[PDB]
Amino acid sequence: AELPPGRLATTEDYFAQQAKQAVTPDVMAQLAYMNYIDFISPFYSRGCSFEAWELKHTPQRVIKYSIAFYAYGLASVALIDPKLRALAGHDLDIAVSKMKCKRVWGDWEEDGFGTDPIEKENIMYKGHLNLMYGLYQLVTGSRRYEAEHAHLTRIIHDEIAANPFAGIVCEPDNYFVQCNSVAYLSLWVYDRLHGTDYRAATRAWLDFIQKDLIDPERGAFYLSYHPESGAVKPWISAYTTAWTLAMVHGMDPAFSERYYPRFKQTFVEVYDEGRKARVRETAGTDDADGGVGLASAFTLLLAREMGDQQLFDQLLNHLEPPAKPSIVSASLRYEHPGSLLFDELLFLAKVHAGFGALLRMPPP
């Protein structure tokens, strides 16, 4: 109802986009940032050109995440406004094209892990890619990437079936729940499109991650698991948990519903007389947004996914005003982005229709 200080649109306005069949003017300005300027906008062309990311100082290892989060937001744009669905589809085609460039996945080879980023392991990369293939096809109805999608889904399914633990590692011997969450969601999306049952593996996964990987009282996942030693790194992680619960809510909403109030009690600090909120990254600290610095931004996405308007408003009042948004020539820019992936994650949270709603996207 009331526009908070430094905000571009109300929480109510974000949540009402889909009912209005229109994105807010600031979301439109973000899409302009994404698409407008020749050569340097991130969605200018399908080529293996990364000038947009160079200009933002994106570290190489983060590029795959930036593209994927953009793609996730774009899928919701398509659902919100039928008149932007073709644009969204176009941008998703670009996203998938760029994602396959060696500048994006080549860390796998440079780090010594292999020359092929798909064949085994590396689930953060190939999970996102497989989700993107599916969202592109849900938005557009095009089979342009279906051959590849059929292949990658099967690699994923086969690697899950072959592993003694439920899921797939990233680097060899590094297991992350948040990266697996994306891979499993990608199976749901393939099943929606094809009528298959690759998603049947999800139960065993949800059982596995609720053992040593979770503190069920705190509603929080541990940082990682390492199959060769059986070790779990003994610190709970807010950003890990927020991202994971958000994606799991589209598969097993009960799971996320169970842990969500505990997660909030463990990590979320409300401040400024109830107007704002910020998220501690681990236990035993008062500091917010430690570690990779993304706890509050992923919690914004979680709040959106769970329909928690009050927490969404508090978090965006913490994140957005200090970053000093402006809209210049109808395009959005932030003078002081507070983290990596800033515009990407604020975009995604502003539009996000729910993973379950994306799974149910009506045909074009």
Sequence ranges of the binding site = 170
CB atoms within 10 A of CB 59: 11
Bridge partner list, 214: 221
Answer yes or no whether residue 233 interacts with its own copies by CB under 8 A: yes
**Could you give the C-alpha distances from 276 to 271, 279, 314, in angstroms and in order?**
5, 11, 4
Q: Which of 13, 26, 38, 81 is catalytic?
A: 38
Touching ligand DXX, residues 194-223 (CB under 6 A): 194, 196
Phi, psi of 270 (to 5 degrees): -85, 135
**Could you give the C-alpha distances from 3 to 48, 233, 313, in angstroms and in order?**
40, 42, 10
Phi, psi of 62 (to 5 degrees): -90, -15
196 contacts which partner out of its own copies, ligand DXX, none, CB within 5 to 8 A by kind?
ligand DXX
Answer yes or no whether residue 234 interacts with its own copies by CB under 8 A: yes
Stretch that binds its own copies, among 145-153, 223-231, 250-258, 351-359 (CB under 8 A): 223-231
Nearer to ligand DXX, 18 or 196 (CB): 196
Answer yes or no whether residue 48 interacts with its own copies by CB under 8 A: yes
Distance CA 287, CA 276 (A): 15
Nearer to its own copies, 170 or 201 (CB): 170
Answer yes or no whether residue 192 interacts with ligand DXX by CB under 6 A: no
Distance CA 154, CA 165 (A): 18
**Binding-site member from 9, 150, 232, 357 for ligand DXX (CB under 6 A):** 150
194 contacts which partner out of its own copies, ligand DXX, none, CB within 5 to 8 A by kind?
ligand DXX
Annotated binding-site residues for (2E)-geraniol read 170
Alpha helices in the chain (DSSP H): 11-15, 17-20, 25-35, 51-55, 63-80, 85-99, 102-105, 107-110, 123-140, 146-162, 177-194, 202-209, 238-248, 253-267, 295-306, 309-319, 342-351, 355-359
Answer yes or no whether residue 148 interacts with ligand DXX by CB under 6 A: no
Stretch that binds its own copies, among 186-194, 266-274, 288-296, 352-360 (CB under 8 A): 288-296
Burial of 323 (0-12, 13-18, 19+ CB in 10 A): middle
CB atoms within 10 A of CB 185: 26
9 close to 3: Cβ distance less than 8 angstroms: yes
In the complex, what is the shortest distance from the CB of residue 85 to its own copies, in angstroms, rounded to a whole number? 9
Nearer to ligand DXX, 192 or 194 (CB): 194
Catalytic, 173? Answer no
Answer yes or no whether residue 41 interacts with ligand DXX by CB under 6 A: no
CB atoms within 10 A of CB 136: 26
**Binding-site member from 3, 16, 204, 330 for its own copies (CB under 8 A):** 330
Provide the annotated active-site residues.
38
In the complex, the residues that contact ligand DXX under the rule CB under 6 A are 150, 194, 196
In the complex, the residues that contact its own copies under the rule CB under 8 A are 25, 32, 35-39, 44-49, 61, 83-84, 86-87, 89-90, 93, 101, 107, 110-113, 140, 142, 144, 171-174, 223, 226, 228-235, 280-285, 287, 289-292, 327-331
